[PDB]
Amino acid sequence: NKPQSWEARAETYSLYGWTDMPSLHQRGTVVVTHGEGPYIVDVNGRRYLDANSGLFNMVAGFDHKGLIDAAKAQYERFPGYHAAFGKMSDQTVMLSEKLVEVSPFDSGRVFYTNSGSEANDTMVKMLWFLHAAEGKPQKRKILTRWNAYHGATAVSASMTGFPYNSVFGLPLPGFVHLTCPHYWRYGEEGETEEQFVARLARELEETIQREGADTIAGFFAEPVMGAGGVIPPAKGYFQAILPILRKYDIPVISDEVVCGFGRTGNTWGCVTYDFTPDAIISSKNLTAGFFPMGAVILGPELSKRLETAIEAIEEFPHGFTASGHPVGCAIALKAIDVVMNEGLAENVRRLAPRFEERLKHIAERPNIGEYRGIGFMWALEAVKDKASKTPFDGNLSVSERIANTCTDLGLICFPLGQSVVLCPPFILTEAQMDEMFDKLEKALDKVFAEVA
Amino acid sequence: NKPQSWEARAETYSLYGWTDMPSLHQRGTVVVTHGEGPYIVDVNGRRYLDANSGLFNMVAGFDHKGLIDAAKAQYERFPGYHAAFGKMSDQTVMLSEKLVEVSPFDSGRVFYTNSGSEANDTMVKMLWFLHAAEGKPQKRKILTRWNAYHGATAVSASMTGFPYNSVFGLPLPGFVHLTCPHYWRYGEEGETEEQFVARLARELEETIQREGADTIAGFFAEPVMGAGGVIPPAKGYFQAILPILRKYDIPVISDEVVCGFGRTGNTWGCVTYDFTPDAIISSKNLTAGFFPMGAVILGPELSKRLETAIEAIEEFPHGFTASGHPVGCAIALKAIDVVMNEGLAENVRRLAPRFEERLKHIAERPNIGEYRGIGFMWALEAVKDKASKTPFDGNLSVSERIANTCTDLGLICFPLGQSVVLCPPFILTEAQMDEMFDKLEKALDKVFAEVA
Lengths: 452, 452
Ligand code: NA
Ligand code: NA
Fold this sequence. Notes:
2 copies of one chain form a homodimer.
Chain A: H1 6-13, H2 21-27, E1 30-36, E2 39-42, E3 47-50, H3 65-77, E4 87-89, H4 90-102, E5 109-113, H5 116-133, E6 141-145, H6 154-159, E7 175-178, H7 183-186, H8 193-211, E8 216-221, H9 237-247, E9 252-255, H10 269-272, E10 279-282, E11 294-298, H11 300-313, H12 326-341, H13 344-362, E12 368-374, E13 377-382, H14 398-408, E14 411-412, E15 414-416, E16 419-422, H15 430-451
Parallel strand pairs in A: 3-14, 6-7, 6-8, 8-9, 9-10
Antiparallel strand pairs in A: 1-2, 2-3, 5-11, 10-11, 12-13, 13-16, 15-16
Bound molecules: sodium ion (2 copies).
């Protein structure tokens, strides 16, 4: 008794991750064979505009010729190696040099992983290693924010600030979640945005005092929270929090897995938000989704401190088999060049006003609580009643209903909580942006007619 | 002040992993540009026989035309996508079907990752998730062995059984390490191999009784410990320990990252050691080193149990951006076919007797305590005195000296503790095997003459 169809074969042998099981059993798996620009095509020849760039990562679309050619050229040249035991590829050396150049740091060091989750798990281990070598082995606690998304390893999931991780008995101890700087949701009745920011700065100081400054290893922040629902921080957030972190000597890590390489309208989200971190975590767009790469980019201060610590023990006992893979490195070098120098990053800057203008129009609807975002990352929040910010009952699954209707209309978008997220490829044309909105608006009309 | 040479550029921008820093500063980074069969070629045009397959993974060598062509063919077809939110590529469905087929399981499910570390971290989360869903949230402890290597995330590093992880303040609580089944090292004076295995089985039962079976989530084992120094278990080990684990309702996981796809002389190390695990962890050879892929392959029992638990919460909140990437799946499908059907796994079986006969002759030297291994994974243990099994002082760095001397002779091998490991590509000919040993023997003569 064996499955025949693509859908039945997918259900027979897969253990689905991040998949709504009632929707999958009703609809079946979407099995994808190829793409063209920002579109994907399934086994039945149905085409969909992927307004999420797959998982925010396919910024140059699904059939980019330059990137396809660069990947093919490296398989022909040198198809695989590692970057451990004093060896690495020429591609690895070139990418480390390029990443330091394009980072906001004047100098630094790069460590590779396959994923953003491994890179955050790596940065945590690096802090534990460094602080212990410096005589502060108790400096282990990691500060992140509620609604932050840092990954899926036990450590990077512990950094992630969502109730869903309770199914794993996570977070592990030592992982502290601060208030999410989403003013619309977390600002209290009668609390101004200025007071909200002052409260988060106070809450951080109280946390450092109650935990003990000598017990805190680092602070990680996505400049704009991505997978958490596209959450630009409340005005003045970083200007209020960063001096508190610097005062208590707590390293600042910018998780640039989503914001890195152009989505916020600048090469880095930390540049958009005008702050210089001690380290950067990069993945996703790093290869435009063509290869699994992650990177820890260490600024001058942490590089020098880790270098001293590594020299004293004579080795850094950490790494992954494919870290610094020559194919991944050649692909990243091309992705960086394509985004920065072939007009993709500029296109996000060019089209962001038109993107916001349309969302502002959509937000006039009685069932849209707000629109939020920047550059090419945006979200629309659904509400039952606007004035009170009352959401629809969780059992109505409004966001999944919108995303499913979108799929039926030939549009892929990302549902999260009571929100619908749009993070389309940087190659999106004005006509394709209109197509994305026309389909989304049709889906919103359908769903809200059913639930309101 | 900018670096000029490849070696200087590597040192300026890299944060080195698994690299002995005193040797790196003395020798410089070996910067690799391409390879040919089992050989790698550096920027200076020097060629080395890589008798470690890179990091055990490059079993088809460094320029395999079939694999290069399969990689190129998939980049032209569909160069990137994910396997989340009820979508995946046709290549993902084909690979999951193929992996269940080639696994020792009659049926099951596959979950993808990029690495073996993420796959072990994933299996641990799956166990915590499952046991809590089945009414036992206290069922969280993970059993591994001393000298085991399971990866580099904080959790897979806690599963790993090496003192070097103390630099990170690891292992985390709940990671229990059993005696390594290395008879030569851990066997007591006057203890026979049968008594040694009986003792290991008694220690396991006492550990279970003292920890409480209701608190133990699972047991992981590499059939042959690979990165830990090539350690085949003492005779009858799995036959003694598995009934105990089965009696106490402790899931058995075979870490097949190194043993999967041919290195022990069978498709799986669990086949070579005649046991059926509840799940398999695969990575490394899965793609012959051409793309970062990891996989959790769940047997019928855990597949059914996890599906029931996931259905109750409607969504399994876990996954990685590149999990089930179409390119990695197309490459894995080719790598499995190349290894199983193009004579590579058979070449391991063909040449394993000749491999062992030469190691047996080398082990006659007074400074070789033992040779150990199976198929295409072997190790030589260095000793100051054979009769008393006394090693050379740690400060002499004997294994490192042999490895460095091998590099100077055009041979790459793997040093670990007091041992030197050989894990060559499956494409190795008899002449290349002879070249491997001729170079190793000269390195052994040089090091032992200076040190003994
Ligand atoms: Na720079
Ligand atoms: Na099978």
